[PDB]
Design a protein around this ligand. Structure first.
Ligand SMILES: [Zn+2]
Length: 257
């Protein structure tokens, strides 16, 4: 019964998921001055031209746009990664106000929201096996600021009315995730975890330096979603973010000077 409320939020998760207090938890604050430039880091290869979106789902903590990951259709490679990671889903974390919502922070600065494009390492055969491995997942994190609209986001915003409550899904074919990427692929990278239970320490995080901008109307639509099921008391889906966790024995690396 975990969530983001006063009684079941991030500070409680450790009781069911003791790894919450582990050595490689996410998100973290990215201290830009102490991140180390690593000239051996390769450019990222984001290959989304053949992506096949299938569906959008309200799972009670966020909404997931899911992809066909039964073939190498939309993959991430390069950067800090060895091998090929397949896109399975993306989702967002966002705030009740424009000054909070991101999970990662940059020099303690919070963004309005954060996009997570979740990929799994094909050497493990499926997502459920991958999350059990220290190099199982690669998550591309992209910050959202409020400003101009993002045209490439609008098709997501428009279907949200159909998935207002927990457990609702809708067909969501022919969505191109390239429309959510900033111009630059400069990034920070560190080893971490899923930011929701089960909090498994299986993620190579790749956090892009450059945010995307979305409009006030687009983020407002995110905030009209519900954490609850239809016919249950209405609780707006807002502030579905975990705060920064201790860095512990980790160094954040930068692809750029
Ligand atoms: Zn996430």
């Amino acid at each position: 019964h975990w969530g983001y409320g006063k009684h079941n939020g991030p500070e409680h998760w450790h009781k069911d998921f003791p790894i919450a207090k582990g050595e490689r938890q996410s998100p973290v604050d990215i201290d830009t001055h102490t991140a180390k430039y690593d000239p051996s880091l390769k450019p990222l290869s984001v290959s989304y031209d053949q992506a096949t979106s299938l569906r959008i789902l309200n799972n009670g903590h966020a909404f997931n746009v899911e992809f066909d990951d039964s073939q190498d259709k939309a993959v991430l490679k390069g950067g800090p990664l060895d091998g090929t990671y397949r896109l399975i889903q993306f989702h967002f974390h966002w705030g009740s106000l424009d000054g909070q919502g991101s999970e990662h922070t940059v020099d303690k600065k919070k963004y309005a929201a954060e996009l997570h494009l979740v990929h799994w390492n094909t050497k493990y055969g499926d997502f459920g096996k991958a999350v059990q491995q220290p190099d199982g997942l690669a998550v591309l994190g992209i910050f959202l600021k409020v400003g101009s609209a993002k045209p490439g986001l609008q098709k997501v915003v428009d279907v949200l009315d159909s998935i207002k409550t927990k457990g609702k899904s809708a067909d969501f074919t022919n969505f191109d995730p390239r429309g959510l990427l900033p111009e630059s692929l400069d990034y920070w990278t560190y080893p971490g975890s899923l930011t929701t239970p089960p909090l498994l320490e299986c993620v190579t995080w790749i956090v892009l330096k450059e945010p995307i901008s979305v409009s006030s109307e687009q983020v407002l639509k995110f905030r009209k979603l519900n954490f609850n099921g239809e016919g249950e008391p209405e609780e707006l889906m807002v502030d579905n973010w975990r705060p920064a966790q201790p860095l512990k024995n980790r160094q954040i690396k930068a692809s750029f000077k």
